[PDB]
Amino acid sequence: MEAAHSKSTEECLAYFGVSETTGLTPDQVKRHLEKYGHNELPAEEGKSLWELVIEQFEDLLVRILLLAACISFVLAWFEEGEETITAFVEPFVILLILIANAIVGVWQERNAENAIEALKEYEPEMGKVYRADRKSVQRIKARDIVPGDIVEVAVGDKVPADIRILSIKSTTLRVDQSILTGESVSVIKHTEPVPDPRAVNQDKKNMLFSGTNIAAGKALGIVATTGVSTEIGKIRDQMAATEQDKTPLQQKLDEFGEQLSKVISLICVAVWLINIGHFNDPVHGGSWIRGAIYYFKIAVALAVAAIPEGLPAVITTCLALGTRRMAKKNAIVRSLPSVETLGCTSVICSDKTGTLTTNQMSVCKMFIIDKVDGDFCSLNEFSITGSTYAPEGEVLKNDKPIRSGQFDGLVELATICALCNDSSLDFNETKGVYEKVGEATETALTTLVEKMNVFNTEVRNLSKVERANACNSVIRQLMKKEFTLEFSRDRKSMSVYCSPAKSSRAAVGNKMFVKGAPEGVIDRCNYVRVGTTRVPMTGPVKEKILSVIKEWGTGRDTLRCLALATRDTPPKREEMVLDDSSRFMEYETDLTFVGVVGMLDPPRKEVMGSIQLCRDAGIRVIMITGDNKGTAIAICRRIGIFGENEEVADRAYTGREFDDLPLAEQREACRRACCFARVEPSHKSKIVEYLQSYDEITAMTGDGVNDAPALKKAEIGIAMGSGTAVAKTASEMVLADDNFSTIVAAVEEGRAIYNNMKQFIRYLISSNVGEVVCIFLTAALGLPEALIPVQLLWVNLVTDGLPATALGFNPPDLDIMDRPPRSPKEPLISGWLFFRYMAIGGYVGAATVGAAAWWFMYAEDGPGVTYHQLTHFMQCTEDHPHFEGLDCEIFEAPEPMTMALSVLVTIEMCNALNSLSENQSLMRMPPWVNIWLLGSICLSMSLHFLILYVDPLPMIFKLKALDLTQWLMVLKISLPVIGLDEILKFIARNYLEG
């Protein structure tokens, strides 16, 4: 029964056909259980280790590699010779990388936690019901509770399901539902029906929400819903139905993979069409078997050369280091991939309280009526000093500190603030300061009462923990608080009923003290207090009051105003139904206006600047707040979201105004709005969807369980460090300090990380292009392998990996926050850079093939068979070229390959330097601009000499230490690549403008 809040208790018992005194019968249970199912959120889909291991070999490139591993294994099974010590090595290394790769994937998916499974923290194991099969309350498993069940809850209990309250056994029922409605204070519950079938949870005063806690009292009620039908269960289904998309980089990397396997297969088809002449060779004889192996051999090398095997580890490592760095800046990233998205943020939706403001409330102004004489009226306005909850401060008039007690009006003002209050003050020793004990707004009143000191008391004779309630305790001992009519959104006021203490047995003397939003309170006032006297509320006097409230709430003071009144002749105690909130406004009528207090929840010191950075970075900032609209706008103007005088009528909306707009207009409304006042949790989700329909990359803050859906929906959900664990687990980022500024700072950081990632992604992929050219060249020229998989793999995982990582540390561009958000669809490589990397690739393909062909021919230590063309053959059966001799296994000599590899390594070290900047000459941006890079290059070269000399290695890699002459030919061939790019960069800098 999802509409229970609006039905009578009798109608709910009737609907389910249950007896309040007995509970459900065993047949009702079986039938209800079968109909509504068990009371629990569905269990997560179990994912077996095998399934988790298989999903690892799901990527297109890992498959290509696995295929390469097979060919490499079978090819190593029928190898010619006996170099088994350095044979099965190749297929093993490939297979091992796939294993490590899988281990990492499985590892991460283990220590990962989902927000849904976290919701289960709010469902208790046990519950207490009343069933016909017994007379005493029996505690069963929450899981077995069902709709219709008469249930019992008491202080300390965790609500087991959504329940309609039947009867409150205690004097009052208090519930802590902070996690669902964001109501910090525990709230009071009643049993009367709430007429609105669409009432938001805060208005459902007769319901207990599954997952919340009873703060005080004992109550009996009937279960309305269970499982996914509860409020928390509905949040659970929303989250489950939320499909998140891959980040822009993941998408680009996925399109890269698809196209890469398309190129690989194409290059294989090519090597075939360039050797179609073999179909003309004589059938008998020939190297049929030795030719097939040759083709499959370049296929493996081709796949290994195309795939940037070390790029993922470089990405992860750069994200981790950046992540640890952001932490220091108070931004805790939970999802590494989110960093890029954060850099692309175009819209930041931010709750105001505690994020844009400090959540430190203090009264700054206050006024009372001075006098009324016909059309003439005068007020007595004051100011108060001190922005802390601390009783440190003083009242003043015309900037002169006065004695509050010297004004009768102020004495009553303080009385009301003192009594009509559910909060207090406490001196936290751990911090040495003060902490609000209750609502921020009420505590401000408490503090005010202390600073005012209407009854000149000796507070300086007490400590920091005693005078924390000095002047307050004084007011209490005067008036006895009988009962309090809690605050309600519809009347926007609250009040306490008080009887004098000095008058034990008095038939009169009772007063109701009222506090609330100005408009409603002032309209219910028939009298205005002037000092101790009283006069009727008149038009001239009301306008005067409203006049000043408007200036304080809508003006540059940006203050939340509260009207304070007194019911001089309150109804007789017995004639009041303290259980039907619907009549509270009635009891708070015929009031006497006492005064108005204006308090400020000050903007963070750093938000003013951060709002500017966002405007300079082309990022929109939307403020979400509980303030009334007029004060919401005034606050926006104050922090810079709106101009001090710009029209913003169609850029600021209340939840109500927005629901009144048809769907078409709500969408448009979100494209230009920067202020949303008084919205329900559902609004955040819709705002996101509408922003996503404009392709915005949205960042959205939240803290309660009710924010989870939206936090999950937003590309960057941002949770409060001081918020719920559920909100955290549903967010990409957590602000350890709750500061809006930490957001802006995290976005810049995201911008600076992406630019560097781009440089090392282009650097690694560029090298792969070159590697392939070398393999394709050595396939069209019929030359012996210049590079083999085991060598390429080392270069792609180690040699190039260090430099790639170093580029991650490239200094950021000074104007990072001076350009609009990057477009998600922006490709990493195209146009002139595409041409550049092709040119560099062709260059790299020749520099490597040449170095090896240079050793086989024009060399001082190798076969002086110049122009001999190894193309002719590798069969060695006709000896057409050589007229006399016995030697052909030199074609497998490690010397030529060591030249090829040293060229690649060296060229790549030079190409790392060319990657410091996309278009800046090494003259403008020298290499030493990044010491990490220089240092990395030295490390890579020393590792190159490691596999050349440390015996076990040179054999494993088929390498052979080079001669100073062979080395000088390396540097001769390599170094020039720096000049090649410099020229290409020069062309991009001058002859390519727009």
Ligand X SMILES: Nc1ncnc2c1ncn2[C@@H]1O[C@H](COP(=O)(O)OP(=O)(O)O)[C@H]2O[C@@]3(O[C@H]21)C([N+](=O)[O-])=CC([N+](=O)[O-])=CC3[N+](=O)[O-]
Contact at 8 Å (CB) between 364 and 715?
A: no
**Choice among 149, 157, 176, 351 that is catalytic:** 351
Q: Which is nearer to ligand X, 705 or 745 (CB)?
A: 705
Q: Determine if residue 815 is labeled as part of a ligand binding site.
A: no
287, interface contact from ligand X, ligand TG1, Mg ion, none, CB < 5-8 Å by kind: none
**By the rule CB under 5 A, 589 interacts with Mg ion:** no
Does 717 contact Na ion by CB under 5 A?
yes
CB 252 to ligand X: min, Å: 39
Task: Give the residue from 916, 703, 823 showing the smallest Cα distance to 340.
Answer: 823
> Which residues lie across from 552 on neighbouring strands?
none
Per-residue contact track with ligand TG1, 745 to 774, x per CB under 6 A?
A: --------------------x--xx--xx-
632 vs 870 by CB, closer to ligand X: 632
Stretch that binds ligand X, among 309-317, 514-522, 767-775, 973-981 (CB under 6 A): 514-522
Nearer to Na ion, 145 or 711 (CB): 711
Closest CA to 900 of 782, 779, 795, 804: 795
CA distance 696 to 248: 13
**By CB under 6 A, is residue 672 in contact with ligand X?**
no
First to last CA, the chain: 65
Q: Does 660 bind ligand X (CB under 6 A)?
A: no
What is the C-alpha separation between 809 and 789, in angstroms, rounded?
29
- Kindly tell me which of 355 and 915 has the beta carbon lying closer to ligand X: 355
String marking each residue 807-846 x if it binds ligand X according to CB under 6 A: ----------------------------------------
Which region, judged by CB under 6 A, interacts with ligand TG1, from 39-47, 247-255, 488-496, 660-668? 247-255
68 touches ligand TG1 by CB under 6 A: no
Binding site partner of 717, from ligand TG1, ligand X, Na ion, none, Cβ cut-off 5-8 A by kind: Na ion
- Any idea what the Cα angle at residue 863 is, between residues 84 and 296, rounded to 5°? 40
Q: Write down the residue that tokens 């409605």 correspond to.
A: 181
| Residue of the chain from 18, 517, 597, 795 that contacts ligand X (CB under 6 A) | 517
CB of 302 to ligand TG1, least distance (A): 9
Question: Which residue lies nearer to ligand X by CB, 503 or 722?
Answer: 722
275 annotated as ligand-binding: no
Residues contacting ligand TG1: total by CB under 6 A? 21
Sheet with strand 173-176: strands edge to edge: 187-189, 173-176, 213-216
To 5 degrees, how large is the angle CA 910–CA 911–CA 913? 70
Nearest approach, Cβ of 747 to Mg ion (angstroms)? 22
CB atoms within 10 A of CB 11: 14
Q: Which two tokens stand for residue 984?
A: 């290409």
Nearest CB to ligand X, comparing residues 420 and 853: 420
Interface with Mg ion, residue 353, by CB under 5 A: yes
Beta strands in 201-305 (DSSP E): 207-208, 213-216, 218-225
Q: Does the annotation list 353 as a binding residue? A: yes
- Closest-CA residue to 985 (of 789, 823, 835, 842): 835
Stretch that binds Na ion, among 68-76, 164-172, 381-389, 710-718 (CB under 5 A): 710-718
Q: Tell which one of 236, 352, 822, 958 touches ligand X (CB under 6 A).
A: 352
* Tokens of residue 416, six digits: 């009301």
Is residue 141 helix, strand or coil?
A: strand
Angle of helix 894-913 versus helix 831-856 axis, rounded to 10? 150
**Buried-state track 379-404, b at ≥16 Cβ within 10 A, e below 16:** bbbbbbebeebbbebebeeeeeeeeb
**Contacts for 800 with CB less than 8 Å, ≥ 6 apart:** 310, 763, 764, 767, 908, 912, 940
How do 382-384 and 395-397 pair as beta strands? antiparallel
Q: Which of 827, 831, 881, 979 binds ligand TG1 (CB under 6 A)?
A: 827
Residue 626 near ligand X by CB under 6 A: yes
Strand partners, 167: 220
Window contacting Mg ion (CB under 5 A); options: 211-219, 284-292, 348-356, 497-505: 348-356
**Cα 529 from Cα 595, distance rounded (Å):** 8
Interface region with Mg ion, contact rule CB under 5 A, candidates 111-119, 141-149, 340-348, 353-361? 353-361
DSSP 685: H
Residue 631 marked in a binding site: no
Q: How far apart are CA 37 and CA 901, in angstroms?
A: 67
Q: How far apart are CA 752 and CA 325, in angstroms?
A: 12
The radius of gyration computed from the CA coordinates of the chain, to the nearest angstrom, equals 38
Structure tokens at 688: 């996101």
Question: With respect to ligand X, which residue has the nearer C-beta, 224 or 440?
Answer: 440
Q: Which is nearer to Mg ion, 149 or 351 (CB)?
A: 351
Specify the stretch interacting with ligand X by CB under 6 A; choose among 234-242, 510-518, 920-928, 946-954: 510-518
| Stretch of 375-383, 468-476, 511-519, 971-979 contacting ligand X, by CB under 6 A | 511-519
CB 720 within 8 A of CB 727: yes
| One residue of 511, 678, 684, 958 binding ligand X per CB under 6 A | 678
Residue 515: name its binding partner from ligand X, Na ion, ligand TG1, none (Cβ under 5 to 8 Å by kind).
Answer: ligand X
Q: With contact defined as beta carbons under 8 Å apart, do 364 and 387 qualify?
A: no
Residue nearest Mg ion, Cβ-based: 353
Which stretch, 326-334, 351-359, 634-642, 857-865, contacts Mg ion (CB under 5 A)? 351-359
Question: Is position 529 annotated in a ligand binding site?
Answer: no
625 belongs to an annotated ligand binding site: yes
How far are the Cα atoms of 685, 843, 906 from residue 975, in angstroms, in the given order? 56, 12, 8
Taking CB under 6 A as the rule, does residue 253 contact ligand TG1? yes
Q: Which of 29, 94, 129, 260 binds ligand TG1 (CB under 6 A)?
A: 260
Cα angle, residue 554 at apex, residues 550 and 556 outer, rounded to 5°? 120
Question: By the 8 A CB rule, do 465 and 443 touch?
Answer: no
Contacts of 423 (CB under 8 A, 6+ apart): 436, 437, 438, 439, 442, 443, 445, 446
What span, in angstroms and rounded, lies between the C-alpha atoms of 447 and 450? 5
Nearer to Na ion, 129 or 714 (CB): 714
Binding to ligand TG1 in span 262-301, by CB under 6 A: 263, 267
Distances (CA, A) of 727 to 115, 346, 439, 485, 698: 8, 22, 22, 33, 17
Question: Quick check: 202 binds Mg ion (CB under 5 A)?
Answer: no
Question: In the bound complex, what is the minimum distance in angstroms from residue 984's beta carbon to ligand TG1?
Answer: 12
- The strand pairing partners of 163, in sequence order, are 208, 223
Asked whether position 473 contacts ligand X by CB under 6 A, the answer is: no
CA distance 643 to 633: 10
Q: Which residues lie across from 401 on neighbouring strands?
A: 396
Say whether residue 22 binds Mg ion (CB under 5 A). no
Nearer to Na ion by Cβ, of 411 and 714: the residue is: 714
Residue 256 touches which member of ligand TG1, ligand X, Mg ion, none, C-beta under 5-8 Å by kind: ligand TG1
- The pairing of beta strand 560-567 with beta strand 511-516: antiparallel
Residues within window 76-115 making contact with ligand X, judged by CB under 6 A: none
Is 254 one of the annotated active-site residues of the chain?
A: no
Among 334, 492, 638, 960, the residue binding ligand X under the rule CB under 6 A is 492
- Which residues of this protein are in contact with Na ion, per CB under 5 A? 712, 714, 717
Annotated binding site for ATP: 353, 442, 489, 515, 560, 625-627, 678, 684, 706
The residues carrying an active-site annotation are: 351
- Which residues of this protein are in contact with ligand TG1, per CB under 6 A? 252-253, 255-256, 259-260, 263, 267, 306, 765, 768-769, 772-773, 776, 827-829, 834, 837-838
- Which residues of this protein are in contact with Mg ion, per CB under 5 A? 353
Annotated binding site for Ca(2+): 304-305, 307, 309, 768, 771, 796, 799-800, 908
